[PDB]
Structure formats: C-alpha cells, structure tokens
Design an enzyme around this catalytic site. Structure first.
Site, PDB file in Angstrom:
ATOM      1  N   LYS C  12       0.836  -1.191   0.000  1.00  0.00           N
ATOM      2  CA  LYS C  12       0.000   0.000   0.000  1.00  0.00           C
ATOM      3  C   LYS C  12       0.875   1.247   0.000  1.00  0.00           C
ATOM      4  O   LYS C  12       2.081   1.179   0.236  1.00  0.00           O
ATOM      5  CB  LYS C  12      -0.924  -0.036   1.215  1.00  0.00           C
ATOM      6  N   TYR C  52     -12.372  -2.997  -2.824  1.00  0.00           N
ATOM      7  CA  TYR C  52     -12.868  -2.987  -1.456  1.00  0.00           C
ATOM      8  C   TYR C  52     -14.396  -2.960  -1.411  1.00  0.00           C
ATOM      9  O   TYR C  52     -14.984  -2.461  -0.451  1.00  0.00           O
ATOM     10  CB  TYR C  52     -12.282  -1.793  -0.699  1.00  0.00           C
ATOM     11  N   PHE C  60     -15.231   3.658   7.491  1.00  0.00           N
ATOM     12  CA  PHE C  60     -13.895   4.052   7.062  1.00  0.00           C
ATOM     13  C   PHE C  60     -13.683   3.915   5.558  1.00  0.00           C
ATOM     14  O   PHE C  60     -12.569   4.155   5.091  1.00  0.00           O
ATOM     15  CB  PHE C  60     -12.830   3.239   7.818  1.00  0.00           C
ATOM     16  N   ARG C  88      -1.444 -14.659   4.027  1.00  0.00           N
ATOM     17  CA  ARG C  88      -2.058 -13.913   5.122  1.00  0.00           C
ATOM     18  C   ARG C  88      -1.268 -14.083   6.416  1.00  0.00           C
ATOM     19  O   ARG C  88      -1.134 -13.135   7.204  1.00  0.00           O
ATOM     20  CB  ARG C  88      -3.503 -14.367   5.329  1.00  0.00           C
ATOM     21  N   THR C  94      -4.707  -8.173  10.577  1.00  0.00           N
ATOM     22  CA  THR C  94      -5.133  -6.950   9.898  1.00  0.00           C
ATOM     23  C   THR C  94      -4.845  -5.718  10.741  1.00  0.00           C
ATOM     24  O   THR C  94      -4.347  -4.706  10.236  1.00  0.00           O
ATOM     25  CB  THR C  94      -6.623  -7.024   9.573  1.00  0.00           C
ATOM     26  N   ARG C 105       3.330  -7.018   9.290  1.00  0.00           N
ATOM     27  CA  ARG C 105       2.728  -5.974  10.118  1.00  0.00           C
ATOM     28  C   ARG C 105       3.310  -5.966  11.524  1.00  0.00           C
ATOM     29  O   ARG C 105       3.435  -4.902  12.136  1.00  0.00           O
ATOM     30  CB  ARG C 105       1.211  -6.144  10.149  1.00  0.00           C
ATOM     31  N   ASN C 115      -1.532  -0.205   7.439  1.00  0.00           N
ATOM     32  CA  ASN C 115      -0.980  -1.528   7.724  1.00  0.00           C
ATOM     33  C   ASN C 115      -0.154  -2.084   6.566  1.00  0.00           C
ATOM     34  O   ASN C 115      -0.024  -3.313   6.434  1.00  0.00           O
ATOM     35  CB  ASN C 115      -2.076  -2.514   8.166  1.00  0.00           C
ATOM     36  N   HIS C 118      -1.596  -5.438   1.556  1.00  0.00           N
ATOM     37  CA  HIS C 118      -2.843  -6.173   1.348  1.00  0.00           C
ATOM     38  C   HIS C 118      -2.529  -7.576   0.858  1.00  0.00           C
ATOM     39  O   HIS C 118      -1.594  -7.769   0.079  1.00  0.00           O
ATOM     40  CB  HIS C 118      -3.759  -5.516   0.289  1.00  0.00           C
ATOM     41  N   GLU C 129      -9.383 -10.602  -7.436  1.00  0.00           N
ATOM     42  CA  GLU C 129      -8.444  -9.486  -7.328  1.00  0.00           C
ATOM     43  C   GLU C 129      -7.384  -9.539  -8.427  1.00  0.00           C
ATOM     44  O   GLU C 129      -6.952  -8.493  -8.928  1.00  0.00           O
ATOM     45  CB  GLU C 129      -7.813  -9.489  -5.926  1.00  0.00           C
TER      46      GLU C 129
HETATM   47  N1  LIG Z   1      -9.465   2.960   9.805  1.00  0.00           N
HETATM   48  C1  LIG Z   1      -9.800   1.654   9.736  1.00  0.00           C
HETATM   49  N2  LIG Z   1      -9.377   0.938   8.661  1.00  0.00           N
HETATM   50  C2  LIG Z   1      -9.683  -0.374   8.550  1.00  0.00           C
HETATM   51  C3  LIG Z   1     -10.475  -1.008   9.618  1.00  0.00           C
HETATM   52  N3  LIG Z   1     -10.642  -2.295   9.274  1.00  0.00           N
HETATM   53  C4  LIG Z   1     -10.011  -2.474   8.089  1.00  0.00           C
HETATM   54  N4  LIG Z   1      -9.435  -1.339   7.659  1.00  0.00           N
HETATM   55  C5  LIG Z   1      -8.668  -1.219   6.398  1.00  0.00           C
HETATM   56  O1  LIG Z   1      -9.371  -1.938   5.383  1.00  0.00           O
HETATM   57  C6  LIG Z   1      -8.530  -2.916   4.782  1.00  0.00           C
HETATM   58  C7  LIG Z   1      -9.380  -4.102   4.362  1.00  0.00           C
HETATM   59  O2  LIG Z   1     -10.046  -4.593   5.519  1.00  0.00           O
HETATM   60  P1  LIG Z   1     -10.161  -6.186   5.676  1.00  0.00           P
HETATM   61  O3  LIG Z   1     -10.491  -6.825   4.347  1.00  0.00           O
HETATM   62  O4  LIG Z   1     -11.191  -6.541   6.727  1.00  0.00           O
HETATM   63  O5  LIG Z   1      -8.675  -6.525   6.197  1.00  0.00           O
HETATM   64  P2  LIG Z   1      -7.504  -7.304   5.392  1.00  0.00           P
HETATM   65  O6  LIG Z   1      -8.029  -8.226   4.318  1.00  0.00           O
HETATM   66  O7  LIG Z   1      -6.743  -8.106   6.423  1.00  0.00           O
HETATM   67  O8  LIG Z   1      -6.599  -6.251   4.795  1.00  0.00           O
HETATM   68  C8  LIG Z   1      -7.534  -3.250   5.880  1.00  0.00           C
HETATM   69  O9  LIG Z   1      -6.338  -3.841   5.368  1.00  0.00           O
HETATM   70  C9  LIG Z   1      -7.315  -1.902   6.541  1.00  0.00           C
HETATM   71  O10 LIG Z   1      -6.363  -1.138   5.787  1.00  0.00           O
HETATM   72  C10 LIG Z   1     -10.898  -0.160  10.754  1.00  0.00           C
HETATM   73  O11 LIG Z   1     -11.579  -0.634  11.686  1.00  0.00           O
HETATM   74  N5  LIG Z   1     -10.530   1.125  10.741  1.00  0.00           N
HETATM   75 MG   LIG Z   2      -9.456  -8.398   2.855  1.00  0.00          MG
END
Ligand SMILES: Nc1nc2c(ncn2[C@@H]2O[C@H](COP(=O)(O)OP(=O)(O)O)[C@@H](O)[C@H]2O)c(=O)[nH]1
Ligand SMILES: [Mg+2]
Ligand SMILES: Nc1nc2c(ncn2[C@@H]2O[C@H](COP(=O)(O)OP(=O)(O)O)[C@@H](O)[C@H]2O)c(=O)[nH]1
Ligand SMILES: Nc1nc2c(ncn2[C@@H]2O[C@H](COP(=O)(O)OP(=O)(O)O)[C@@H](O)[C@H]2O)c(=O)[nH]1
Ligand SMILES: Nc1nc2c(ncn2[C@@H]2O[C@H](COP(=O)(O)OP(=O)(O)O)[C@@H](O)[C@H]2O)c(=O)[nH]1
Ligand SMILES: Nc1nc2c(ncn2[C@@H]2O[C@H](COP(=O)(O)OP(=O)(O)O)[C@@H](O)[C@H]2O)c(=O)[nH]1
Ligand SMILES: Nc1nc2c(ncn2[C@@H]2O[C@H](COP(=O)(O)OP(=O)(O)O)[C@@H](O)[C@H]2O)c(=O)[nH]1
Ligand SMILES: [Mg+2]
Ligand SMILES: [Mg+2]
Ligand SMILES: [Mg+2]
Ligand SMILES: [Mg+2]
Ligand SMILES: [Mg+2]
Lengths: 153, 153, 153, 153, 153, 153
Positions: C12, C52, C60, C88, C94, C105, C115, C118, C129
């Site tokens: 990212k 997303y 968010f 992962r 995450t 991370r 973080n 992705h 994707e």
């Molecule tokens: N600010 C904020 N960003 C979030 C939160 N949860 C997820 N994100 C962002 O959204 C991305 C996608 O969320 P998710 O698919 O659930 O997590 P990932 O697949 O592990 O990356 C994450 O990698 C974070 O950058 C949150 O609670 N707050």
């Molecule tokens: Mg995801």
C-alpha cells in the site's frame, strides 16, 4: 597505536529521520569498537556553530547549521585502535557521490548536504569534539567480554 | 546535477531465478533513490536485441540475447541525483571478477555472462532504454515523504 | 492443495513511502513462493472501490479509498502451495496491534489504517483481485530452478 | 489510544556486552515508533534498587541488581500508539524459554536472568520509570517525516 | 578459469568466539560459490605449524600458532570460478586497518593478529591446504540446482 | 535444566541447495547456543534409515530417505540450556504450513517433505542421534567468551 583511542560519531538529523540509528550503530558494533558514550540531543545553534567553527567562512555554513538544528542528533563516542581513521572509512567519503557501497554513506546517502553522519577527522579534533558534546561523567568505563578476541595484546 | 534524473535498472533472469529481487530493490531503496516504474516482463527477442543493439557485432551477442530471453526480467526506473552513475557504482563492475564486495555484483555474482542485473551507462542511454522498456503512463509521479531529508536542493 | 495456487499481494502507499518494497518482496521470495506478476501502479478510484467493494458500507470506506489513491502501490501475484492462507500468515493480523513480531505488520506497522500491505483472504477472492488488477498478459509463465527443492514430487 | 504514549525500554548489560544495541534499536525503529530519549548510563545501585523496588522480596533480587550493575545500560524512551503493550510484545516473554522467535528475547536470549532488555509493563509504571532514569530536558520533542504514513489521523 | 577451482577458507578461533560463523558462510554462499567440505575442528599443533610453515621465521609465528590453538576453527572448502582470488577479495586485506567496508575483515575485524578468517592465497597453496586439513572423503560431490544461473555454458 | 544439554540439528539437502546454511547457523548462533560439532556429509542410506527408524512403517518413508540421500547435509551439535526444546521452537512446526513466521520453517519452507532442517525431539533422542552421526572426537570442548552474559548459572 593505542586501543583506547576515542572518536566522536554523530548521526545527523537526516539519519535519525530516515530511521538509520540502528544500522549505523551496528556498523561500529560489528567491527569490534566499543561504545563508551551516547545520547540523543537537540543542541543549541551556538554549540553547532562551535562544532563547525572552522567552516564559518564556507558558503554552505548557514545551511549546514540550519540543517543540523532541524532534528535530533544521536551523539556517540566510540573507542578502539585507530577508531578515528577507521571510523571515517566506515562512514565513507564526505560527498556520498564519491563514497563506496559498503560504507554508511555508500549504502544510505546521496547529497553532501544530507550525508547522515559525522565523524572526527583527527585524534586532536576528536578530543575537542568529545569535550564539546559530552560531560566527562557521560563517558562510561567498561571492558568488553570479547576484548581479547578483538585485540592481540 | 538534477534530482529528477532517471535510470533504467533491470534484474536479469539469473537474478530472478536466484531469489535476488528483494535484495536488489533494497540497495536502491535504502540509498534514497525513488522507484518511479516497475514491472515483471518477459520481453520479445526483438526488444532485447534493440536493447543491446550496440553489441550486435560481439561474439557473445547471440548467447546474451538467449539468456536474457530465458526467464523473467524485473524492469525498473529509479530517480534521483546522479542515479545513472551512482546506480552503476551500486551494481559494480560489469565482470563480477573485477567488482568490489558491497556492490550487487560483488556480493551476488561470478560470471560476466550471469551478472544478475543491468544499469544504463549514461543519461542519454537511460532515456532511450526507459522509452524502449516502458510506456509513458507506466512512470508514476509521486513525492517521497523523506525527499527533504535525502536532498538539500 | 496444488502448488499453482495464486494470491494477490499489494504494498500500500504507506509501505512504498516508508521504503518497505524490498523487505516485503524478500519475505515472500525467501519462503519459496514464485513471483508471477508485478507492477508499480497508481490505479483509478473505481478500481480501488471495486477492490474494497465488500467494505463500501463501512464508515472508514471513503478514507480507505482516498488513502489508497494517495501514493503508488506495488501490485504482485505470488504463486505456490497454499499461498493465499500462508500469505495472510506472513502479512500478519489486519490490525497490527494484534499481529506477531516476525510478520510484515508485526515488524513494520502500528495502525490498522496504515498496515502497509494487502493480501487476498480466499482463493475465490484472489482470482477476483488478480483479474481486477492484472491483464492476463502480465502474468509470466516460468519454472523456478529450485522448484523440486521447495516441493516434493 | 493516543499516539504520544511513551514507554521506557532499556538494553541490559548482557545486551550491551553481546553487541545487540543496533539490532534492538532497529526493532523499534522499523516498527514505526519514535525515539525521544536515549543515553548510555552506569546508574548507581540505589537507582537500580528503586527501579526494581517491587521485587525486593524476591529471592533473585540481589542477583538481578548485581547483574544490572555489571555493565553499561542503554536507556531509552520510545513514543507511539500503544507503545507500552506493543513494546512488551516486541521484547517477548520475560523468560526467553517462553518467548517466540521473531521477538528480541526469542531471537537473542536464553536465561530469564540474562534476558537482554527491559520494558515498562504499564503506562503508569512507564511514567514512573521515565522520571527515575531521565531528566525532563533529556526528552527531545520532534516530528517524524513519515508520521502521517504510520498513523491514520 | 575453470568453475571447479577450490580454495580453503577457515574461520579462526576469534571468528568462532565472536559469533561470526553464519555471517561468514553467507558471504560465500550468497556470491554463488559451492560449499564442498566443512567441519568444526581443533587441529593439532603440528598441523597449524605446517599450515603456516612459510611464516616459521616471522617473530609473530609462535603467538599465531598458539592463538590458532586457542579455540575451535570452522574449516571449509569452497568451489567455483576464480574462488581463490575472489575469496581473498571477499575476506579483505590481511591487516583489517587496510581493508574495505563490505569485506569480512572490513566489516568485522580490527587487528591483524585477530583477523577472524583465513583464505588460501594461490591455487597451488589451496591444494596444499585442502590436503592438509581434509581427508578426500570429506569433500562432497554435488551439483547446485542454480549452477546454470551462476555460470554461462 | 543444565546448560550443557546438546541437540542434533541438521540442514537437509533442500536447505543446502537453496543456500540457507548461513542463515540457519545464525539463528542458533545469535540465540546464544554453542556450536560443538559440525560437518558437511553425504551419509549412507543405512544411516538415514536408522536415523528415521521410527518412521519405517510410514507411507512417506522411502521417499523421505531418497530425498535425504539426494544432496549434502550439514550436521551439527548445538549446546545450551533447553537447546532441544528451544531448538524445535526455532525450527518451527514440522509441516511449514502450520509454522510461524520468524521460525526457520516459517521463513523459508512450504512443504512438509521439503522442510529444510531436522532437530532432535527429546534429550534422549538427541543423545542417540548425536552418537549416530558423530564420532566422539568430532565434538569440540570449548568455552564461549560470552558464556557468563548468556547464562546466570
Ligand atoms: N481505519 C480503519 N481501517 C480499517 C479497519 N478495518 C479495516 N481497515 C482497512 O481496510 C482494509 C481491508 O479490511 P479487511 O479486508 O477486513 O482486512 P484485510 O483483508 O486483512 O486487509 C484493511 O487492510 C485496513 O487497511 C478499521 O476498523 N478502521
Ligand atoms: Mg481483505
Ligand atoms: N552543501 C554542502 N555541504 C558540505 C560541503 N562540504 C561539507 N559539507 C557539510 O559539512 C560537513 C563538514 O564538512 P567537512 O568537515 O569538510 O567534512 P567531514 O569531516 O567529512 O564531515 C560535511 O559532513 C557536510 O555535511 C559542500 O561542499 N556543500
Ligand atoms: N559472455 C560474455 N558476456 C558479456 C561480455 N561482456 C558483456 N557481457 C554481457 O553483456 C552485457 C552488456 O555489456 P555492457 O553494456 O558492455 O556492460 P554493462 O553496461 O555494464 O552491462 C553485460 O552486462 C554482460 O551481461 C563478455 O565478454 N562475455
Ligand atoms: N533469576 C531470575 N530472574 C528473574 C525472574 N523473574 C524475573 N527476573 C528478572 O527480573 C526482571 C524483572 O522481572 P519482572 O518485572 O517480573 O519481568 P519483566 O517486567 O518482563 O522484566 C526480569 O526482566 C528478569 O530479568 C526469575 O524467576 N529468576
Ligand atoms: N601479530 C601479527 N600477525 C600477523 C602479521 N602478519 C600476519 N599475521 C597473521 O598471520 C596470518 C598469515 O599471514 P599471511 O599469510 O601473510 O596473511 P593472509 O594469507 O592474508 O592471512 C595472518 O592472517 C595474520 O593472522 C603481523 O605483522 N603481526
Ligand atoms: N511427505 C511427507 N513427509 C513427512 C510427513 N511427516 C513427516 N515427514 C518428514 O519426516 C521428517 C521426520 O518426521 P517427524 O520426526 O515426525 O517430525 P520432526 O521431528 O519435526 O522432523 C519430517 O521432518 C519431514 O521431513 C508427511 O506426512 N509427508
Ligand atoms: Mg571538519
Ligand atoms: Mg552497454
Ligand atoms: Mg516489573
Ligand atoms: Mg596466507
Ligand atoms: Mg521423529
């Protein structure tokens, strides 16, 4: 040459900002030199102008001092045989354009005005700089457990 | 020298096969250069022959092209002050036998025919190689958060 | 299951900005996975919103899309046995607060909103994707010289 | 949680003697935390007994204090979101036998009585320890150039 | 000349004592050379006197033999093109004061009497040293999976 | 637990082929364990079948033996407090799929049939494996200069 020679090494604000404190310390640590003083400081412009007093006539002096004020400095005293000269070799050429890969500046720096670190250029200047930056009680007397594996008598 | 000079660096198929993509990128990244374009490619023979056109008369040309066709290439554009010349210094001597430890070839390569990377040898050749290997929209415009700590400008 | 499973890993804009491209690539390279596609890109807003899309009702979401537009992204396809799930695990939790040291991370990140990377969370989502971020012509077919030392026959 | 939380991290004499100052600093530097105070010290037994005052009833107390006197200590204050708790996670389990590889103790230490480093175990204890080890003017106020890439608002 | 040239590299007791076995092996491994023999040994005095027989009239001879007896030695045979000369280049100057950062001695050593390693200085001397330190049965015949990526055909 | 416990660690042919000798040794070295024996060997099939005798009834036995015969092995004895159990923790889970990043398998391996290393699973099995793989005179008695900094004893 005496193994208790000391030099002043500083990580300049660009080295601190770019996250190079760990790697720079490791270069000296891994070579066998002994850290005998260290502190993170933000010294006043007056101390920095005295540290670079011999360059007060240079056209870059004002910018150099401004840059040295612009963030924290990691100030160190390292001890070992020929540490002043070898420390300078570890740092690499003043202008990173002239430096060799494998040195600090040859691995991490580009611009002479942002060359990450300082090292004393002579034993006498190291003594002057050490007394300018550190109080005598900030120098820690200790004996490395591997001293006799780094030095032959 | 302008801080927006660009050079073409490529990891050759041997560097990809031997798992050196990460390390080679880190050499340029840690030095403070800016990655402005990157892609993994398997370019056609005609593109490789044009890349090496000035070597078309050398006895090793046909073998060089075949080797450059034999696996993926990681093609990159890096930007920074004197990145062409300093990039070549980071790569090390064309023949790794003559290269210095601490350079890419001095750390990772033995044979001149397997010297793991390419770097443009002049600003004018870099512009020609960049245009050969990349479409203009593949060069990404961005500003590094540490730009003012790498450069005095 | 099969050693030709593929996942989408992206660095990212904060990972690019903080100089983590080399280290992140090395994590996957050293583990034995195969890089089959890679490019530095600044994708359009609608591509990120589609990336997303499952999160479009989260509060968010708009800020996540806006930050993902705020700098370049290093987009990659990695291939290998169980690369989706193991990818992962390499990335870490995450929320970096919940991540373990030794993961990307857990070594490099603090905020869930910053973080650094992705990775696809399922094989089906990986295929989605990969088709969203890469043209099929950008996936390079090759055979690693150490395939038979990474995988049992 | 506030991003200006601070914790006290010390490298104990065994970490200094074994040449781990650089690598330990890098663990915190690479994670995104900000160094706001550091010094190499050889504190008096009275300061060390106060630092460990809550363990004065333990059978190992006298040996712990002796060991903490036996060489220099690198004392640091690190700042960032949840740095007290995450700093402890970075250090690993108090007994290195229980620690995970990838943590400081899981990479470098074996004996609970020689576990390389100290970290505050709560925000309140960190405030107590910071005031015990540092003078207020030894804490340097500065702003990291990548703060907005480490933290989302 | 030929890619089956061999050299004798030894990590001296100070390199073993200071925890440098892994790093030194990696220098040769990463460059592309082939480890064909290795053992940790504490050789007899007459073997070391024969190893250094050309130096028996030097004033430092007895002390050199005595220090070489003072801890274990990691003895190795490395194979590859020009490995004798390139091995010396990797080791760095005999006196570390004259060595370049990026070499083993320029990264790790200070004193000529404690220069962490040995490498044969000629092909003829390599053959002598290999026959002195290894039984032929201890040289292992194998083919590296990446041979054709390290060497041109 | 005694600080003179010993374990048998072996780098399997895939770890040798993939250039992991240096890194794996550094994991144990940096943790503070003592290398007391090491050799590169190509052991006979009978020795490998005896090493894995308790698996003689498993369906994968014949393939395991053939793979263990297919390249050099780096056989080692490491000594230290709880080195058997802590060695297994450093190696990571038998199946790399279940291993944690930061362990050897969690950093370098994917397949259970190609899991780059072996470690004894108990003190009694370690004594049996040490005796199988080494002659008693191949175990070197020495005392580390940092012994008293690794151990409280
Ligand atoms: N600010 C904020 N960003 C979030 C939160 N949860 C997820 N994100 C962002 O959204 C991305 C996608 O969320 P998710 O698919 O659930 O997590 P990932 O697949 O592990 O990356 C994450 O990698 C974070 O950058 C949150 O609670 N707050
Ligand atoms: Mg995801
Ligand atoms: N902008 C600029 N800065 C310079 C120049 N020369 C030296 N400096 C800066 O001034 C510092 C002190 O210069 P000097 O004592 O001559 O070199 P040093 O002892 O190697 O650090 C150097 O480390 C540079 O940061 C120059 O020509 N231009
Ligand atoms: N086999 C062989 N290959 C060579 C020789 N010289 C150069 N090459 C290859 O040709 C590439 C381009 O050569 P050149 O442009 O002169 O050097 P470079 O700019 O440093 O890459 C080199 O990087 C080598 O891969 C040679 O004498 N023999
Ligand atoms: N010898 C010995 N030392 C201990 C023991 N427990 C703790 N220590 C030492 O005392 C320090 C402080 O203990 P404690 O506050 O409970 O653990 P910490 O906050 O994780 O450092 C630890 O870091 C160890 O160095 C023990 O059971 N035996
Ligand atoms: N104390 C001392 N030791 C030396 C000196 N010269 C060489 N040695 C040691 O003797 C070893 C062999 O010397 P030489 O063959 O000339 O150097 P090398 O082949 O580069 O190791 C060196 O590696 C040093 O450990 C010296 O002038 N003084
Ligand atoms: N192909 C295959 N190999 C296996 C399997 N289980 C174990 N192995 C191999 O057999 C070795 C010894 O197995 P074991 O003693 O139970 O595990 P270890 O002590 O952790 O090495 C492992 O390290 C693997 O290399 C399996 O289910 N399939
Ligand atoms: Mg000066
Ligand atoms: Mg050319
Ligand atoms: Mg406590
Ligand atoms: Mg010699
Ligand atoms: Mg078993």
């Amino acid at each position: 040459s005496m193994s208790n020679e000391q030099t002043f090494i500083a990580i300049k604000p660009d080295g601190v900002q770019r996250g190079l404190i760990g790697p720079i310390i490791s270069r000296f640590e891994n070579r066998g030199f002994k850290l005998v003083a260290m502190k993170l400081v933000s010294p006043p412009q007056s101390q920095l102008e005295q540290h670079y007093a011999d360059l007060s006539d240079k056209p870059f002096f004002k910018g150099l001092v401004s840059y040295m004020l612009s963030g924290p400095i990691c100030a160190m005293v390292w001890e070992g045989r020929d540490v002043v000269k070898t420390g300078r070799t570890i740092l690499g050429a003043t202008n990173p354009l002239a430096s060799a890969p494998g040195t600090i500046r040859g691995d991490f720096a580009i611009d002479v005005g942002r060359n990450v670190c300082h090292g004393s250029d002579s034993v006498e200047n190291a003594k002057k700089e050490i007394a300018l930056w550190f109080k005598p009680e900030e120098l820690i007397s200790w004996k490395s457990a591997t001293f006799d594996w780094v030095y032959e008598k």
